[PDB]
Amino acid sequence: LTGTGVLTESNKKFLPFQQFGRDIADTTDAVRILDITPCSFGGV
Amino acid sequence: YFKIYSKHTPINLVRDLPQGFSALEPLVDLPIGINITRFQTLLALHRS
Numbered sequence A: 001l002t003g004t005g006v007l008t009e010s011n012k013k014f015l016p017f018q019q020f021g022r023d024i025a026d027t028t029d030a031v032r033i034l035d036i037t038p039c040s041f042g043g044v
Numbered sequence B: 001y002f003k004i005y006s007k008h009t010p011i012n013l014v015r016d017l018p019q020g021f022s023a024l025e026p027l028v029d030l031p032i033g034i035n036i037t038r039f040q041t042l043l044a045l046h047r048s
C-alpha cells in the first residue's frame, strides 16, 4: 500500500486482528500504530 | 477459509438468553478449505 503523507504517533487503540484503519470516505487513515496525515496543501 | 469468531461474557441468569449487544471479535481464520455440511457438538459428562 503506497501513498504520500506524514507519519504521526497515534493515540487511538487498535486490535490484534486489525491492521489498517480507514475513516469516513473509505480512505487510508492509519497503518500498522501510526496515523497518516497528508502534509499541508491549499490554494495560493 | 474457516473463520471462527469468538467472544466471552459474564452473565448472571439461571435459564435464559442474555440481553444486550456485544461485539464478536475475530479469534482465528484457519486456511483449510474443506467441504462441510453436517456438524456435531462435543460435551463433557461426569462420572462417579
Ligand SMILES: *[C@@H]1O[C@H](CO)[C@@H](O[C@@H]2O[C@H](CO)[C@@H](O)[C@H](O)[C@H]2NC(C)=O)[C@H](O)[C@H]1NC(C)=O
Pocket: B035, B036, B037
Ligand atoms: C459437499 O458434499 C456434499 C455431499 O453430501 C455435496 O452435496 C451434493 O453435491 C452434488 C454435486 O456435486 C449433488 O449432485 C448432490 O445432490 C448433493 N447432495 C446433497 C445431499 O446435497 C456438496 O455439493 C458438497 N459441497 C461442495 C462445496 O463441494
